[PDB]
Design an enzyme around this catalytic site. Structure first.
Site, mmCIF file in Angstrom:
data_model
loop_
_atom_site.group_PDB
_atom_site.id
_atom_site.type_symbol
_atom_site.label_atom_id
_atom_site.label_comp_id
_atom_site.label_asym_id
_atom_site.label_seq_id
_atom_site.Cartn_x
_atom_site.Cartn_y
_atom_site.Cartn_z
ATOM 1 N N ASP A 48 93.168 32.202 122.623
ATOM 2 C CA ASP A 48 94.069 33.199 122.065
ATOM 3 C C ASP A 48 95.142 32.374 121.384
ATOM 4 O O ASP A 48 95.880 31.629 122.046
ATOM 5 C CB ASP A 48 94.644 34.042 123.199
ATOM 6 C CG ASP A 48 95.662 35.069 122.720
ATOM 7 O OD1 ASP A 48 96.215 34.887 121.629
ATOM 8 O OD2 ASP A 48 95.884 36.078 123.413
ATOM 9 N N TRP A 74 100.201 37.323 128.924
ATOM 10 C CA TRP A 74 100.644 38.518 128.252
ATOM 11 C C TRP A 74 100.003 39.702 128.994
ATOM 12 O O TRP A 74 98.837 39.664 129.287
ATOM 13 C CB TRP A 74 100.115 38.397 126.832
ATOM 14 C CG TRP A 74 100.378 39.467 125.883
ATOM 15 C CD1 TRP A 74 101.600 40.008 125.537
ATOM 16 C CD2 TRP A 74 99.414 40.077 125.045
ATOM 17 N NE1 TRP A 74 101.410 40.960 124.547
ATOM 18 C CE2 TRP A 74 100.083 40.992 124.211
ATOM 19 C CE3 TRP A 74 98.032 39.916 124.904
ATOM 20 C CZ2 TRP A 74 99.385 41.782 123.247
ATOM 21 C CZ3 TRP A 74 97.360 40.689 123.980
ATOM 22 C CH2 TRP A 74 98.044 41.603 123.156
ATOM 23 N N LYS A 116 103.325 36.418 114.193
ATOM 24 C CA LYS A 116 104.652 35.753 114.371
ATOM 25 C C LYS A 116 104.778 34.731 113.282
ATOM 26 O O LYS A 116 105.814 34.532 112.650
HETATM 27 C C1 LIG Z 1 99.298 35.542 123.905
HETATM 28 C C2 LIG Z 1 99.250 36.680 122.920
HETATM 29 N N1 LIG Z 1 98.092 37.322 122.696
HETATM 30 C C3 LIG Z 1 97.970 38.347 121.834
HETATM 31 C C4 LIG Z 1 99.040 38.836 121.089
HETATM 32 C C5 LIG Z 1 98.843 39.990 120.134
HETATM 33 O O1 LIG Z 1 99.322 39.625 118.842
HETATM 34 P P1 LIG Z 1 99.358 40.706 117.648
HETATM 35 O O2 LIG Z 1 98.286 41.699 118.025
HETATM 36 O O3 LIG Z 1 100.763 41.256 117.699
HETATM 37 O O4 LIG Z 1 99.051 39.894 116.413
HETATM 38 C C6 LIG Z 1 100.376 38.212 121.245
HETATM 39 C C7 LIG Z 1 101.572 38.702 120.463
HETATM 40 N N2 LIG Z 1 101.756 40.143 120.696
HETATM 41 C C8 LIG Z 1 103.075 40.381 121.263
HETATM 42 C C9 LIG Z 1 103.947 41.257 120.625
HETATM 43 S S1 LIG Z 1 105.332 41.190 121.662
HETATM 44 C C10 LIG Z 1 104.742 40.062 122.844
HETATM 45 C C11 LIG Z 1 105.572 39.636 124.009
HETATM 46 O O5 LIG Z 1 104.944 38.942 124.842
HETATM 47 O O6 LIG Z 1 106.755 40.045 123.954
HETATM 48 C C12 LIG Z 1 103.449 39.723 122.442
HETATM 49 C C13 LIG Z 1 100.483 37.087 122.200
HETATM 50 O O7 LIG Z 1 101.667 36.450 122.411
#
Ligand SMILES: Cc1ncc(COP(=O)(O)O)c(CNc2csc(C(=O)O)c2)c1O
Ligand SMILES: Cc1ncc(COP(=O)(O)O)c(CNc2csc(C(=O)O)c2)c1O
Lengths: 383, 383
Positions: A198, A117, A233
């Site tokens: 993570d 990410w 999610k």
């Molecule tokens: C590997 C990983 N690490 C951290 C996050 C952060 O999640 P939230 O902060 O949204 O709970 C996420 C999810 N955050 C996210 C929103 S859209 C997205 C994408 O890759 O499109 C990713 C994740 O897939």
């Protein structure tokens, strides 16, 4: 003061969006889960104050989180080796971990998979930590390049942090097998890495318990680790910012002492965490009826994604792709690399109005029975 | 990794709590505001997704916030000179400001009043910024030591940030008069300070518009400033983490460019802000009926605090204090220094079960008609 600041580094709105970041159902919506609506109604009826939570948030949320991660009856839990702070999302959990590590330990470097990410580098760099990449993706077999991974990580020094995606690797959907997790856990002990899990997609690969196997293999071997988890999610609670930072140390005295500094890092950031979303999660997880409804909703999402993976591969074959896309069936979670190049992705957008990210990652949950044939015809056209 | 970490640096629960941090009504409760409950019901009925907000949060929340701060029809608003990010509380707004400044400007130092809220130093130091103190409190006249303030701030260099509490100075309840604000605004321009307004109590001194006079006097004089605001106390939304970081620059091009970097600082921290509380604030502020109910609830709190200030002074006189406490009537917001020493405060706790902070700060909203006589008898006993 601001006159010289450099700018930081929609087309869809102005056709199919596979570049979306959230789950979509078969109608293309991201509705509030029914379990969540029921919990929100209960909170509206029963909350009598908005008095601040403690720095680490709602105790029941922390307990339920640790059971999800480690299993009920886990030795880590029994031995009081883990402390959990409720945070604003998985991102907040990653940043609390990074600030905690930067200020209280000798960590200088975090290892992240290539690819990952994109926000991982931003978060760790914000805390003053360098980010290094390890090899991950075998683009020929569309598989985990395990040998490359291990050879890359040989450059990691003792006391470096190595970040692992718990399941549903983003962007590849390629996860270590249990045996590969066990090999990595052993290696991490031998090399002195601090594992940082993570875990943003627990439940989206095979199931809640199965998706935590890899983390649990590490937890069985390590005195210390950190988990940054997210309920965005798996509860559809994206905007409520519901995650957790779980710290694990050798014993209760050590984890409590270290966790005091994690709480200091939170206090200097956002003081204490947002109640509404985490209270929804605690209400659901701690209630047999709501948890059962939620677990089925999560199963429904996991299964719908699986059906789209299978429908995508079948439909590409039917539309004359004449290429092996079977790797898609085996991959886990909402994301996969399609194998398209950045120019094919650009073409897809411009000539066909089908939107993916430049890496060729697609969100399989943007796919529906209704949009699948045009989407696949478009992909076939750019091959 | 964690074995050597130093610990970071209840008695009440184990009698009267004036060391509390929130508003309490005349029954000693911190209920959810009725306007908030009505807004939460509307959201439960009408929300159809929890899809992530943008990095800067709900647009209507930003608009309503700027109108609160600057006034409807403000030139800053008309000229598109201000951008607002919704943040997790005022603390989150302060930390976003600090991270933005540390990474994108030459700021190295923030000036804070002696005394202030203790977390100011923690937040700014977390972002790598030094904190310096300026004189504030005339402990003899229980007044603003304006000469000392100005003499202290003469040590501030051009390009330092100076933090001002917008109204209801915490812990003293002593605010500059409008003329004193105007003198400070002029001085700040001349000396090249960047003003940082911390506005956690708008509405609790004299009224929403009156309490923003000082900020507006600064905004009339400065090309650039930052406001960190909080809706925790004035909406009773403490645990929902509802605040805002507002950036002001000379023109729209400059503020947009700088704000891109503020959004990058947010993205690397908690990604995007928690919807529930800010959506409650936007729903209320943008609806004539709900806003009227909320404005009256806030007036009720402001007035109840005023009645306790007056009751406290009268009751101390009646219980034989024989000391001038009239300064309390003039002070603004929930907090005042009582004038008690740290040992009198300790005595108060140990001999009488009355709890204040060691500085002698008391939360006037912990006072009620029912608890006032015993509380004052206790204070008289330690004089
Ligand atoms: C590997 C990983 N690490 C951290 C996050 C952060 O999640 P939230 O902060 O949204 O709970 C996420 C999810 N955050 C996210 C929103 S859209 C997205 C994408 O890759 O499109 C990713 C994740 O897939
Ligand atoms: C001057 C000032 N700055 C920042 C804050 C942080 O507000 P929230 O983060 O709670 O919205 C606050 C309010 N935070 C707070 C909670 S208890 C407390 C106290 O002084 O007891 C203060 C404040 O008074």
């Amino acid at each position: 003061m601001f006159e010289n600041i450099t700018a930081a580094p929609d087309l869809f709105r102005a056709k199919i969006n596979l570049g979306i970041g959230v789950y979509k159902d078969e109608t293309g919506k991201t509705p509030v889960l029914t379990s969540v609506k029921k919990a929100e109604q209960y909170l509206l009826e029963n909350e009598t104050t908005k008095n601040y939570l403690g720095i680490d948030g709602i105790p029941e949320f922390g307990r339920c989180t640790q059971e999800l991660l480690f299993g009920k009856g886990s030795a880590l839990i029994n031995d009081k080796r883990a402390r959990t702070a409720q945070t604003p999302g998985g991102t907040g959990a990653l940043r609390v971990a990074a600030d905690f590590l930067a200020k209280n330990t000798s960590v200088k470097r975090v290892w992240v998979s290539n690819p990952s990410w994109p926000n991982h580098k931003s978060v760790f760099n914000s805390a003053g930590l360098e980010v290094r990449e390890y090899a991950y993706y075998d683009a020929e077999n569309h598989t985990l390049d395990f040998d490359a991974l291990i050879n890359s990580l040989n450059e990691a020094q003792a006391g470096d942090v190595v970040l692992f995606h718990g399941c549903c690797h983003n962007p590849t959907g390629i996860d270590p097998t249990l045996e590969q997790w066990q090999t990595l856990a052993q290696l991490s002990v031998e090399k002195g890495w601090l594992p940082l899990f993570d875990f943003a997609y627990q439940g989206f690969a095979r199931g809640l318990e199965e998706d935590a196997e890899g983390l649990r293999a590490f937890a069985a071997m390590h005195k210390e680790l950190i988990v940054a988890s997210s309920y965005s999610k798996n509860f559809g609670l994206y905007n409520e910012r519901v995650g957790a930072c779980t710290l694990v140390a050798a014993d209760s005295e050590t984890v409590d002492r270290a966790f005091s500094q994690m709480k200091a890092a939170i206090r200097a950031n956002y003081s204490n965490p947002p109640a509404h979303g985490a209270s929804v999660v605690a209400t659901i997880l701690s209630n047999d009826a709501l948890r059962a409804i939620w677990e089925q909703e999560l199963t429904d999402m996991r299964q719908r994604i699986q059906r789209m993976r299978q429908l995508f591969v079948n439909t590409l074959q039917e539309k004359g792709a004449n290429r092996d896309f079977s790797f898609i069936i085996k991959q886990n979670g909402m994301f996969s690399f399609s194998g398209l190049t950045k120019e094919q992705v650009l073409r897809l957008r411009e000539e066909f109005g089908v939107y993916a990210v430049a890496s060729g990652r697609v969100n399989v949950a943007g796919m529906t029975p209704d949009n699948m044939a045009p989407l696949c015809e478009a992909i076939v056209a750019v091959l």
